[PDB]
Short mmCIF file of the N, C-alpha and C atoms (twelve columns), coordinates in Angstrom:
data_MODEL
# 
_entry.id   MODEL 
# 
loop_
_atom_site.group_PDB 
_atom_site.id 
_atom_site.type_symbol 
_atom_site.label_atom_id 
_atom_site.label_alt_id 
_atom_site.label_comp_id 
_atom_site.label_asym_id 
_atom_site.label_seq_id 
_atom_site.Cartn_x 
_atom_site.Cartn_y 
_atom_site.Cartn_z 
_atom_site.pdbx_PDB_model_num 
ATOM 1   N N  . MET A 1   -8.246  -7.575  8.141   1 
ATOM 2   C CA . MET A 1   -7.240  -6.801  7.403   1 
ATOM 3   C C  . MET A 1   -7.886  -6.019  6.266   1 
ATOM 4   N N  . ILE A 2   -7.294  -4.872  5.926   1 
ATOM 5   C CA . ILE A 2   -7.534  -4.100  4.708   1 
ATOM 6   C C  . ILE A 2   -6.199  -4.154  3.955   1 
ATOM 7   N N  . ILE A 3   -6.218  -4.036  2.632   1 
ATOM 8   C CA . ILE A 3   -5.146  -4.369  1.705   1 
ATOM 9   C C  . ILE A 3   -5.058  -3.201  0.737   1 
ATOM 10  N N  . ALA A 4   -4.038  -2.354  0.877   1 
ATOM 11  C CA . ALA A 4   -3.910  -1.193  -0.001  1 
ATOM 12  C C  . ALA A 4   -3.302  -1.605  -1.327  1 
ATOM 13  N N  . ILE A 5   -3.718  -0.966  -2.422  1 
ATOM 14  C CA . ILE A 5   -3.162  -1.185  -3.748  1 
ATOM 15  C C  . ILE A 5   -3.213  0.172   -4.461  1 
ATOM 16  N N  . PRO A 6   -2.062  0.784   -4.794  1 
ATOM 17  C CA . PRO A 6   -2.047  1.978   -5.619  1 
ATOM 18  C C  . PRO A 6   -2.416  1.583   -7.043  1 
ATOM 19  N N  . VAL A 7   -3.371  2.261   -7.667  1 
ATOM 20  C CA . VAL A 7   -3.822  1.934   -9.017  1 
ATOM 21  C C  . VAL A 7   -3.660  3.156   -9.907  1 
ATOM 22  N N  . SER A 8   -3.424  2.933   -11.200 1 
ATOM 23  C CA . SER A 8   -3.273  4.005   -12.169 1 
ATOM 24  C C  . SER A 8   -4.590  4.746   -12.387 1 
ATOM 25  N N  . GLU A 9   -5.725  4.078   -12.179 1 
ATOM 26  C CA . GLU A 9   -7.063  4.592   -12.408 1 
ATOM 27  C C  . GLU A 9   -8.009  3.883   -11.444 1 
ATOM 28  N N  . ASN A 10  -9.145  4.510   -11.131 1 
ATOM 29  C CA . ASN A 10  -10.199 3.909   -10.334 1 
ATOM 30  C C  . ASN A 10  -11.049 3.133   -11.319 1 
ATOM 31  N N  . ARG A 11  -10.774 1.838   -11.446 1 
ATOM 32  C CA . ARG A 11  -11.523 0.925   -12.295 1 
ATOM 33  C C  . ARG A 11  -11.991 -0.264  -11.442 1 
ATOM 34  N N  . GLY A 12  -12.422 -0.036  -10.194 1 
ATOM 35  C CA . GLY A 12  -12.913 -1.085  -9.299  1 
ATOM 36  C C  . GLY A 12  -11.929 -2.245  -9.208  1 
ATOM 37  N N  . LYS A 13  -12.422 -3.452  -9.434  1 
ATOM 38  C CA . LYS A 13  -11.633 -4.676  -9.545  1 
ATOM 39  C C  . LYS A 13  -10.593 -4.579  -10.670 1 
ATOM 40  N N  . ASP A 14  -11.002 -4.088  -11.843 1 
ATOM 41  C CA . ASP A 14  -10.204 -3.863  -13.046 1 
ATOM 42  C C  . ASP A 14  -9.134  -2.764  -12.901 1 
ATOM 43  N N  . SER A 15  -9.029  -2.084  -11.750 1 
ATOM 44  C CA . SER A 15  -7.984  -1.107  -11.439 1 
ATOM 45  C C  . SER A 15  -6.587  -1.705  -11.665 1 
ATOM 46  N N  . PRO A 16  -5.842  -1.281  -12.702 1 
ATOM 47  C CA . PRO A 16  -4.499  -1.785  -12.923 1 
ATOM 48  C C  . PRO A 16  -3.544  -1.092  -11.955 1 
ATOM 49  N N  . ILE A 17  -2.658  -1.865  -11.335 1 
ATOM 50  C CA . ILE A 17  -1.689  -1.377  -10.363 1 
ATOM 51  C C  . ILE A 17  -0.828  -0.238  -10.953 1 
ATOM 52  N N  . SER A 18  -0.644  0.842   -10.184 1 
ATOM 53  C CA . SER A 18  0.348   1.884   -10.431 1 
ATOM 54  C C  . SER A 18  1.658   1.444   -9.791  1 
ATOM 55  N N  . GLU A 19  2.745   2.156   -10.078 1 
ATOM 56  C CA . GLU A 19  4.016   1.810   -9.500  1 
ATOM 57  C C  . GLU A 19  4.199   2.505   -8.150  1 
ATOM 58  N N  . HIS A 20  4.070   3.830   -8.164  1 
ATOM 59  C CA . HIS A 20  4.731   4.698   -7.205  1 
ATOM 60  C C  . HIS A 20  3.666   5.127   -6.213  1 
ATOM 61  N N  . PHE A 21  3.450   4.294   -5.197  1 
ATOM 62  C CA . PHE A 21  2.495   4.508   -4.116  1 
ATOM 63  C C  . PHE A 21  2.413   5.976   -3.674  1 
ATOM 64  N N  . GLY A 22  3.559   6.636   -3.459  1 
ATOM 65  C CA . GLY A 22  3.609   8.007   -2.961  1 
ATOM 66  C C  . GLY A 22  2.943   9.057   -3.864  1 
ATOM 67  N N  . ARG A 23  2.640   8.726   -5.121  1 
ATOM 68  C CA . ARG A 23  1.896   9.530   -6.090  1 
ATOM 69  C C  . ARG A 23  1.008   8.600   -6.923  1 
ATOM 70  N N  . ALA A 24  0.272   7.708   -6.258  1 
ATOM 71  C CA . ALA A 24  -0.801  6.951   -6.886  1 
ATOM 72  C C  . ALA A 24  -2.028  7.874   -6.957  1 
ATOM 73  N N  . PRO A 25  -2.790  7.909   -8.061  1 
ATOM 74  C CA . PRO A 25  -4.001  8.725   -8.154  1 
ATOM 75  C C  . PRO A 25  -5.166  8.237   -7.285  1 
ATOM 76  N N  . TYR A 26  -5.212  6.943   -6.956  1 
ATOM 77  C CA . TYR A 26  -6.266  6.331   -6.157  1 
ATOM 78  C C  . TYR A 26  -5.633  5.216   -5.321  1 
ATOM 79  N N  . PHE A 27  -6.288  4.837   -4.224  1 
ATOM 80  C CA . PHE A 27  -5.881  3.769   -3.325  1 
ATOM 81  C C  . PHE A 27  -7.052  2.791   -3.198  1 
ATOM 82  N N  . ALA A 28  -6.938  1.644   -3.875  1 
ATOM 83  C CA . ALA A 28  -7.880  0.533   -3.823  1 
ATOM 84  C C  . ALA A 28  -7.586  -0.260  -2.558  1 
ATOM 85  N N  . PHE A 29  -8.059  0.242   -1.415  1 
ATOM 86  C CA . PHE A 29  -8.055  -0.469  -0.149  1 
ATOM 87  C C  . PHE A 29  -9.162  -1.526  -0.208  1 
ATOM 88  N N  . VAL A 30  -8.804  -2.766  -0.530  1 
ATOM 89  C CA . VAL A 30  -9.704  -3.918  -0.447  1 
ATOM 90  C C  . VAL A 30  -9.719  -4.436  0.990   1 
ATOM 91  N N  . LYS A 31  -10.691 -5.261  1.368   1 
ATOM 92  C CA . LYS A 31  -10.741 -5.881  2.691   1 
ATOM 93  C C  . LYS A 31  -10.576 -7.382  2.539   1 
ATOM 94  N N  . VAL A 32  -10.765 -8.095  3.640   1 
ATOM 95  C CA . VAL A 32  -11.032 -9.519  3.624   1 
ATOM 96  C C  . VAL A 32  -11.891 -9.798  4.857   1 
ATOM 97  N N  . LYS A 33  -12.782 -10.775 4.769   1 
ATOM 98  C CA . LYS A 33  -13.626 -11.343 5.810   1 
ATOM 99  C C  . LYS A 33  -13.251 -12.808 5.749   1 
ATOM 100 N N  . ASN A 34  -12.621 -13.332 6.800   1 
ATOM 101 C CA . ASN A 34  -12.026 -14.663 6.833   1 
ATOM 102 C C  . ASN A 34  -11.031 -14.867 5.684   1 
ATOM 103 N N  . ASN A 35  -11.478 -15.295 4.501   1 
ATOM 104 C CA . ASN A 35  -10.646 -15.633 3.346   1 
ATOM 105 C C  . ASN A 35  -11.242 -15.106 2.037   1 
ATOM 106 N N  . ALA A 36  -12.245 -14.231 2.105   1 
ATOM 107 C CA . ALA A 36  -12.880 -13.657 0.932   1 
ATOM 108 C C  . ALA A 36  -12.840 -12.130 1.016   1 
ATOM 109 N N  . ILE A 37  -12.918 -11.412 -0.113  1 
ATOM 110 C CA . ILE A 37  -12.679 -9.959  -0.238  1 
ATOM 111 C C  . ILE A 37  -13.482 -9.131  0.776   1 
ATOM 112 N N  . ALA A 38  -14.675 -9.578  1.149   1 
ATOM 113 C CA . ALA A 38  -15.699 -8.854  1.898   1 
ATOM 114 C C  . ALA A 38  -16.204 -7.567  1.247   1 
ATOM 115 N N  . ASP A 39  -15.311 -6.660  0.851   1 
ATOM 116 C CA . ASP A 39  -15.624 -5.260  0.607   1 
ATOM 117 C C  . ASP A 39  -14.480 -4.570  -0.141  1 
ATOM 118 N N  . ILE A 40  -14.760 -3.418  -0.752  1 
ATOM 119 C CA . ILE A 40  -13.842 -2.630  -1.576  1 
ATOM 120 C C  . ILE A 40  -13.999 -1.154  -1.172  1 
ATOM 121 N N  . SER A 41  -12.890 -0.413  -1.108  1 
ATOM 122 C CA . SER A 41  -12.816 1.034   -1.048  1 
ATOM 123 C C  . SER A 41  -11.733 1.487   -2.033  1 
ATOM 124 N N  . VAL A 42  -12.069 1.727   -3.306  1 
ATOM 125 C CA . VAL A 42  -11.178 2.470   -4.199  1 
ATOM 126 C C  . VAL A 42  -11.545 3.939   -4.060  1 
ATOM 127 N N  . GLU A 43  -10.831 4.612   -3.165  1 
ATOM 128 C CA . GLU A 43  -10.998 6.025   -2.889  1 
ATOM 129 C C  . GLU A 43  -9.920  6.790   -3.658  1 
ATOM 130 N N  . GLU A 44  -10.221 8.040   -3.995  1 
ATOM 131 C CA . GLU A 44  -9.268  9.003   -4.497  1 
ATOM 132 C C  . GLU A 44  -8.121  9.182   -3.511  1 
ATOM 133 N N  . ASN A 45  -6.960  9.560   -4.038  1 
ATOM 134 C CA . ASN A 45  -5.894  10.080  -3.205  1 
ATOM 135 C C  . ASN A 45  -6.221  11.546  -2.907  1 
ATOM 136 N N  . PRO A 46  -6.125  12.039  -1.665  1 
ATOM 137 C CA . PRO A 46  -6.251  13.472  -1.400  1 
ATOM 138 C C  . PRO A 46  -5.033  14.267  -1.913  1 
ATOM 139 N N  . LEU A 47  -3.959  13.590  -2.332  1 
ATOM 140 C CA . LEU A 47  -2.626  14.160  -2.517  1 
ATOM 141 C C  . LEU A 47  -1.903  13.448  -3.674  1 
ATOM 142 N N  . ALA A 48  -2.584  13.115  -4.770  1 
ATOM 143 C CA . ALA A 48  -2.032  12.239  -5.804  1 
ATOM 144 C C  . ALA A 48  -0.772  12.814  -6.439  1 
ATOM 145 N N  . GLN A 49  -0.764  14.127  -6.641  1 
ATOM 146 C CA . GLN A 49  0.252   14.866  -7.384  1 
ATOM 147 C C  . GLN A 49  -0.011  16.348  -7.097  1 
ATOM 148 N N  . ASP A 50  0.131   16.721  -5.820  1 
ATOM 149 C CA . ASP A 50  -0.433  17.959  -5.283  1 
ATOM 150 C C  . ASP A 50  0.522   18.547  -4.236  1 
ATOM 151 N N  . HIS A 51  0.237   18.469  -2.928  1 
ATOM 152 C CA . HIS A 51  1.050   19.125  -1.894  1 
ATOM 153 C C  . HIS A 51  2.472   18.558  -1.801  1 
ATOM 154 N N  . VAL A 52  2.652   17.261  -2.060  1 
ATOM 155 C CA . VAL A 52  3.888   16.496  -1.872  1 
ATOM 156 C C  . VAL A 52  4.469   16.717  -0.463  1 
ATOM 157 N N  . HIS A 53  3.967   15.949  0.506   1 
ATOM 158 C CA . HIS A 53  4.512   15.881  1.857   1 
ATOM 159 C C  . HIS A 53  4.244   14.508  2.457   1 
ATOM 160 N N  . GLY A 54  4.618   14.293  3.717   1 
ATOM 161 C CA . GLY A 54  4.343   13.073  4.463   1 
ATOM 162 C C  . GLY A 54  2.861   12.857  4.784   1 
ATOM 163 N N  . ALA A 55  1.930   13.477  4.052   1 
ATOM 164 C CA . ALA A 55  0.502   13.438  4.331   1 
ATOM 165 C C  . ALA A 55  -0.267  12.415  3.484   1 
ATOM 166 N N  . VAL A 56  0.277   11.968  2.339   1 
ATOM 167 C CA . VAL A 56  -0.258  10.819  1.590   1 
ATOM 168 C C  . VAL A 56  -0.433  9.620   2.543   1 
ATOM 169 N N  . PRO A 57  0.606   9.201   3.294   1 
ATOM 170 C CA . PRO A 57  0.482   8.107   4.236   1 
ATOM 171 C C  . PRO A 57  -0.325  8.507   5.470   1 
ATOM 172 N N  . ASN A 58  -0.266  9.773   5.904   1 
ATOM 173 C CA . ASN A 58  -1.032  10.218  7.068   1 
ATOM 174 C C  . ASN A 58  -2.529  9.957   6.870   1 
ATOM 175 N N  . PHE A 59  -3.029  10.156  5.643   1 
ATOM 176 C CA . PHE A 59  -4.368  9.764   5.213   1 
ATOM 177 C C  . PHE A 59  -4.585  8.258   5.398   1 
ATOM 178 N N  . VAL A 60  -3.869  7.390   4.675   1 
ATOM 179 C CA . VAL A 60  -4.133  5.945   4.712   1 
ATOM 180 C C  . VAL A 60  -3.938  5.308   6.107   1 
ATOM 181 N N  . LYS A 61  -3.159  5.925   6.993   1 
ATOM 182 C CA . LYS A 61  -3.040  5.560   8.406   1 
ATOM 183 C C  . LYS A 61  -4.288  5.881   9.241   1 
ATOM 184 N N  . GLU A 62  -5.242  6.656   8.733   1 
ATOM 185 C CA . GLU A 62  -6.577  6.768   9.318   1 
ATOM 186 C C  . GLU A 62  -7.509  5.724   8.688   1 
ATOM 187 N N  . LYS A 63  -7.172  5.172   7.519   1 
ATOM 188 C CA . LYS A 63  -8.042  4.257   6.783   1 
ATOM 189 C C  . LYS A 63  -7.897  2.823   7.294   1 
ATOM 190 N N  . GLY A 64  -7.749  2.658   8.610   1 
ATOM 191 C CA . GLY A 64  -7.955  1.430   9.379   1 
ATOM 192 C C  . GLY A 64  -7.144  0.208   8.932   1 
ATOM 193 N N  . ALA A 65  -6.066  0.390   8.166   1 
ATOM 194 C CA . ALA A 65  -5.489  -0.661  7.338   1 
ATOM 195 C C  . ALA A 65  -4.616  -1.669  8.092   1 
ATOM 196 N N  . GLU A 66  -4.119  -2.689  7.378   1 
ATOM 197 C CA . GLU A 66  -3.284  -3.758  7.927   1 
ATOM 198 C C  . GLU A 66  -2.223  -4.188  6.912   1 
ATOM 199 N N  . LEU A 67  -2.603  -4.540  5.679   1 
ATOM 200 C CA . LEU A 67  -1.690  -4.937  4.611   1 
ATOM 201 C C  . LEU A 67  -1.661  -3.846  3.534   1 
ATOM 202 N N  . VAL A 68  -0.581  -3.811  2.767   1 
ATOM 203 C CA . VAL A 68  -0.362  -2.990  1.593   1 
ATOM 204 C C  . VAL A 68  0.284   -3.928  0.565   1 
ATOM 205 N N  . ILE A 69  -0.095  -3.836  -0.709  1 
ATOM 206 C CA . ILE A 69  0.431   -4.628  -1.811  1 
ATOM 207 C C  . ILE A 69  0.771   -3.646  -2.931  1 
ATOM 208 N N  . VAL A 70  2.060   -3.478  -3.210  1 
ATOM 209 C CA . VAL A 70  2.588   -2.347  -3.970  1 
ATOM 210 C C  . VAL A 70  3.643   -2.815  -4.973  1 
ATOM 211 N N  . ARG A 71  3.860   -2.060  -6.051  1 
ATOM 212 C CA . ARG A 71  4.790   -2.477  -7.098  1 
ATOM 213 C C  . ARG A 71  6.173   -1.868  -6.883  1 
ATOM 214 N N  . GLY A 72  6.290   -0.540  -6.914  1 
ATOM 215 C CA . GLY A 72  7.580   0.134   -6.799  1 
ATOM 216 C C  . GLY A 72  7.907   0.613   -5.382  1 
ATOM 217 N N  . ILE A 73  6.992   1.398   -4.801  1 
ATOM 218 C CA . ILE A 73  7.040   2.123   -3.520  1 
ATOM 219 C C  . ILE A 73  8.369   2.874   -3.236  1 
ATOM 220 N N  . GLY A 74  8.595   3.355   -2.007  1 
ATOM 221 C CA . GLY A 74  9.779   4.093   -1.571  1 
ATOM 222 C C  . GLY A 74  9.735   4.328   -0.055  1 
ATOM 223 N N  . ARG A 75  10.857  4.752   0.537   1 
ATOM 224 C CA . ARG A 75  11.073  4.682   1.985   1 
ATOM 225 C C  . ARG A 75  10.105  5.537   2.813   1 
ATOM 226 N N  . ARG A 76  9.613   6.686   2.335   1 
ATOM 227 C CA . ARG A 76  8.665   7.485   3.134   1 
ATOM 228 C C  . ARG A 76  7.371   6.701   3.330   1 
ATOM 229 N N  . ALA A 77  6.941   5.938   2.326   1 
ATOM 230 C CA . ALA A 77  5.741   5.133   2.447   1 
ATOM 231 C C  . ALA A 77  6.003   3.926   3.342   1 
ATOM 232 N N  . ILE A 78  7.163   3.258   3.238   1 
ATOM 233 C CA . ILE A 78  7.555   2.260   4.222   1 
ATOM 234 C C  . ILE A 78  7.420   2.853   5.643   1 
ATOM 235 N N  . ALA A 79  7.861   4.095   5.886   1 
ATOM 236 C CA . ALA A 79  7.766   4.729   7.204   1 
ATOM 237 C C  . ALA A 79  6.324   4.915   7.735   1 
ATOM 238 N N  . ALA A 80  5.293   4.716   6.908   1 
ATOM 239 C CA . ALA A 80  3.885   4.766   7.288   1 
ATOM 240 C C  . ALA A 80  3.467   3.463   7.950   1 
ATOM 241 N N  . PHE A 81  3.631   2.367   7.204   1 
ATOM 242 C CA . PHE A 81  3.696   0.989   7.674   1 
ATOM 243 C C  . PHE A 81  4.395   0.953   8.996   1 
ATOM 244 N N  . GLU A 82  5.613   1.479   9.027   1 
ATOM 245 C CA . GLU A 82  6.490   1.276   10.145  1 
ATOM 246 C C  . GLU A 82  6.003   2.010   11.382  1 
ATOM 247 N N  . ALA A 83  4.992   2.889   11.276  1 
ATOM 248 C CA . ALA A 83  4.387   3.399   12.491  1 
ATOM 249 C C  . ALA A 83  3.521   2.336   13.148  1 
ATOM 250 N N  . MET A 84  2.927   1.450   12.352  1 
ATOM 251 C CA . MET A 84  1.817   0.613   12.799  1 
ATOM 252 C C  . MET A 84  2.054   -0.858  12.463  1 
ATOM 253 N N  . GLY A 85  3.288   -1.231  12.119  1 
ATOM 254 C CA . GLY A 85  3.619   -2.596  11.702  1 
ATOM 255 C C  . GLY A 85  2.794   -3.065  10.495  1 
ATOM 256 N N  . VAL A 86  2.331   -2.143  9.647   1 
ATOM 257 C CA . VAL A 86  1.331   -2.450  8.613   1 
ATOM 258 C C  . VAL A 86  2.076   -3.111  7.459   1 
ATOM 259 N N  . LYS A 87  1.907   -4.422  7.248   1 
ATOM 260 C CA . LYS A 87  2.682   -5.250  6.326   1 
ATOM 261 C C  . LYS A 87  2.688   -4.628  4.934   1 
ATOM 262 N N  . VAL A 88  3.832   -4.644  4.253   1 
ATOM 263 C CA . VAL A 88  3.974   -4.114  2.910   1 
ATOM 264 C C  . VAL A 88  4.520   -5.233  2.032   1 
ATOM 265 N N  . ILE A 89  3.644   -5.949  1.340   1 
ATOM 266 C CA . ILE A 89  4.034   -6.919  0.327   1 
ATOM 267 C C  . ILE A 89  4.343   -6.158  -0.963  1 
ATOM 268 N N  . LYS A 90  5.401   -6.557  -1.680  1 
ATOM 269 C CA . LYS A 90  5.907   -5.805  -2.825  1 
ATOM 270 C C  . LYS A 90  6.088   -6.723  -4.045  1 
ATOM 271 N N  . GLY A 91  6.022   -6.156  -5.257  1 
ATOM 272 C CA . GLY A 91  6.341   -6.852  -6.508  1 
ATOM 273 C C  . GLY A 91  5.125   -7.314  -7.315  1 
ATOM 274 N N  . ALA A 92  3.918   -6.867  -6.958  1 
ATOM 275 C CA . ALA A 92  2.698   -7.269  -7.650  1 
ATOM 276 C C  . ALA A 92  2.635   -6.649  -9.054  1 
ATOM 277 N N  . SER A 93  1.866   -7.249  -9.961  1 
ATOM 278 C CA . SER A 93  1.682   -6.767  -11.323 1 
ATOM 279 C C  . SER A 93  0.392   -7.371  -11.879 1 
ATOM 280 N N  . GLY A 94  -0.496  -6.553  -12.459 1 
ATOM 281 C CA . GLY A 94  -1.830  -6.978  -12.884 1 
ATOM 282 C C  . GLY A 94  -2.939  -6.042  -12.395 1 
ATOM 283 N N  . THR A 95  -4.005  -6.589  -11.797 1 
ATOM 284 C CA . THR A 95  -5.256  -5.896  -11.455 1 
ATOM 285 C C  . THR A 95  -5.696  -6.215  -10.022 1 
ATOM 286 N N  . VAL A 96  -6.547  -5.391  -9.399  1 
ATOM 287 C CA . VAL A 96  -6.776  -5.464  -7.954  1 
ATOM 288 C C  . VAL A 96  -7.401  -6.808  -7.556  1 
ATOM 289 N N  . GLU A 97  -8.410  -7.265  -8.298  1 
ATOM 290 C CA . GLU A 97  -9.092  -8.532  -8.004  1 
ATOM 291 C C  . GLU A 97  -8.192  -9.748  -8.173  1 
ATOM 292 N N  . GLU A 98  -7.035  -9.545  -8.783  1 
ATOM 293 C CA . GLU A 98  -6.069  -10.566 -9.071  1 
ATOM 294 C C  . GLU A 98  -4.925  -10.462 -8.073  1 
ATOM 295 N N  . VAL A 99  -4.414  -9.267  -7.749  1 
ATOM 296 C CA . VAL A 99  -3.471  -9.050  -6.654  1 
ATOM 297 C C  . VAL A 99  -3.935  -9.778  -5.396  1 
ATOM 298 N N  . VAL A 100 -5.202  -9.569  -5.045  1 
ATOM 299 C CA . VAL A 100 -5.777  -10.133 -3.844  1 
ATOM 300 C C  . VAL A 100 -5.794  -11.658 -3.955  1 
ATOM 301 N N  . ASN A 101 -6.081  -12.210 -5.140  1 
ATOM 302 C CA . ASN A 101 -5.932  -13.638 -5.357  1 
ATOM 303 C C  . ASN A 101 -4.477  -14.050 -5.178  1 
ATOM 304 N N  . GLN A 102 -3.505  -13.397 -5.821  1 
ATOM 305 C CA . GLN A 102 -2.098  -13.816 -5.807  1 
ATOM 306 C C  . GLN A 102 -1.555  -13.927 -4.369  1 
ATOM 307 N N  . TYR A 103 -1.982  -13.015 -3.496  1 
ATOM 308 C CA . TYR A 103 -1.670  -13.018 -2.077  1 
ATOM 309 C C  . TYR A 103 -2.368  -14.154 -1.343  1 
ATOM 310 N N  . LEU A 104 -3.681  -14.307 -1.526  1 
ATOM 311 C CA . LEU A 104 -4.439  -15.374 -0.877  1 
ATOM 312 C C  . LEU A 104 -3.936  -16.740 -1.348  1 
ATOM 313 N N  . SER A 105 -3.450  -16.820 -2.583  1 
ATOM 314 C CA . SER A 105 -2.829  -17.976 -3.202  1 
ATOM 315 C C  . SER A 105 -1.403  -18.227 -2.684  1 
ATOM 316 N N  . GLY A 106 -0.901  -17.378 -1.776  1 
ATOM 317 C CA . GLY A 106 0.319   -17.590 -1.003  1 
ATOM 318 C C  . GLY A 106 1.570   -17.103 -1.724  1 
ATOM 319 N N  . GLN A 107 1.445   -16.728 -2.997  1 
ATOM 320 C CA . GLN A 107 2.600   -16.480 -3.847  1 
ATOM 321 C C  . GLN A 107 3.242   -15.157 -3.428  1 
ATOM 322 N N  . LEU A 108 2.397   -14.148 -3.236  1 
ATOM 323 C CA . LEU A 108 2.789   -12.757 -3.121  1 
ATOM 324 C C  . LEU A 108 3.360   -12.536 -1.737  1 
ATOM 325 N N  . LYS A 109 4.484   -11.836 -1.661  1 
ATOM 326 C CA . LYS A 109 5.232   -11.706 -0.419  1 
ATOM 327 C C  . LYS A 109 6.163   -10.492 -0.397  1 
ATOM 328 N N  . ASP A 110 6.850   -10.314 0.725   1 
ATOM 329 C CA . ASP A 110 7.522   -9.098  1.159   1 
ATOM 330 C C  . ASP A 110 9.005   -9.326  1.462   1 
ATOM 331 N N  . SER A 111 9.554   -10.459 1.036   1 
ATOM 332 C CA . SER A 111 10.966  -10.814 1.136   1 
ATOM 333 C C  . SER A 111 11.505  -10.587 2.564   1 
ATOM 334 N N  . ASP A 112 12.684  -9.984  2.724   1 
ATOM 335 C CA . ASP A 112 13.419  -9.853  3.985   1 
ATOM 336 C C  . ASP A 112 14.173  -8.522  3.972   1 
ATOM 337 N N  . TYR A 113 13.809  -7.576  4.849   1 
ATOM 338 C CA . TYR A 113 14.161  -6.169  4.648   1 
ATOM 339 C C  . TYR A 113 14.319  -5.342  5.934   1 
ATOM 340 N N  . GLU A 114 14.429  -5.971  7.097   1 
ATOM 341 C CA . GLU A 114 14.292  -5.300  8.397   1 
ATOM 342 C C  . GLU A 114 15.541  -5.428  9.275   1 
ATOM 343 N N  . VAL A 115 16.701  -5.435  8.618   1 
ATOM 344 C CA . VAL A 115 18.012  -5.323  9.233   1 
ATOM 345 C C  . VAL A 115 18.042  -4.200  10.276  1 
ATOM 346 N N  . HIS A 116 18.670  -4.479  11.419  1 
ATOM 347 C CA . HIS A 116 18.544  -3.707  12.652  1 
ATOM 348 C C  . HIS A 116 19.894  -3.141  13.097  1 
ATOM 349 N N  . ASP A 117 20.692  -2.659  12.148  1 
ATOM 350 C CA . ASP A 117 22.067  -2.184  12.347  1 
ATOM 351 C C  . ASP A 117 22.224  -0.696  12.001  1 
ATOM 352 N N  . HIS A 118 21.378  -0.177  11.112  1 
ATOM 353 C CA . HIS A 118 21.561  1.085   10.406  1 
ATOM 354 C C  . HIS A 118 20.205  1.766   10.284  1 
ATOM 355 N N  . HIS A 119 20.193  3.100   10.215  1 
ATOM 356 C CA . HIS A 119 19.019  3.925   9.937   1 
ATOM 357 C C  . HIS A 119 19.481  5.304   9.443   1 
ATOM 358 N N  . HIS A 120 18.575  6.279   9.297   1 
ATOM 359 C CA . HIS A 120 18.864  7.626   8.790   1 
ATOM 360 C C  . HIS A 120 18.206  8.657   9.710   1 
ATOM 361 N N  . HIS A 121 18.408  8.500   11.020  1 
ATOM 362 C CA . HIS A 121 17.405  8.727   12.059  1 
ATOM 363 C C  . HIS A 121 16.145  7.908   11.762  1 
ATOM 364 N N  . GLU A 122 15.203  7.921   12.695  1 
ATOM 365 C CA . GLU A 122 13.812  7.613   12.416  1 
ATOM 366 C C  . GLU A 122 13.230  8.780   11.621  1 
ATOM 367 N N  . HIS A 123 12.977  9.934   12.258  1 
ATOM 368 C CA . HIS A 123 12.108  11.022  11.792  1 
ATOM 369 C C  . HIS A 123 10.660  10.531  11.763  1 
ATOM 370 N N  . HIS A 124 9.808   11.066  12.635  1 
ATOM 371 C CA . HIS A 124 8.366   10.996  12.441  1 
ATOM 372 C C  . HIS A 124 8.088   11.948  11.290  1 
# 
């Protein structure tokens, strides 16, 4: 798995979480190897506060990912996940090296949100 985290700044491990994934300035895609971080990719956003389209997620959907750990987020970014079943854990607060601990520590989670009665079309 790779683990996305929108951060206010590229500060490696010390990257403090941003709220709004859809206009995060950087994406700290951490990894895991068995049960340890393995590796880090805090890459720039190609679209932090720029074109404003469905292309912020189109980028991270090439970045090989599996999990996302986000504070605020919104439905267009959920629709990125939802192309690829890419888990979106929500409600984190703190720093990237700690988010990854809070999840591995079992605490961090994604509640219950996949009611199958209603939609707004799909729309790719």
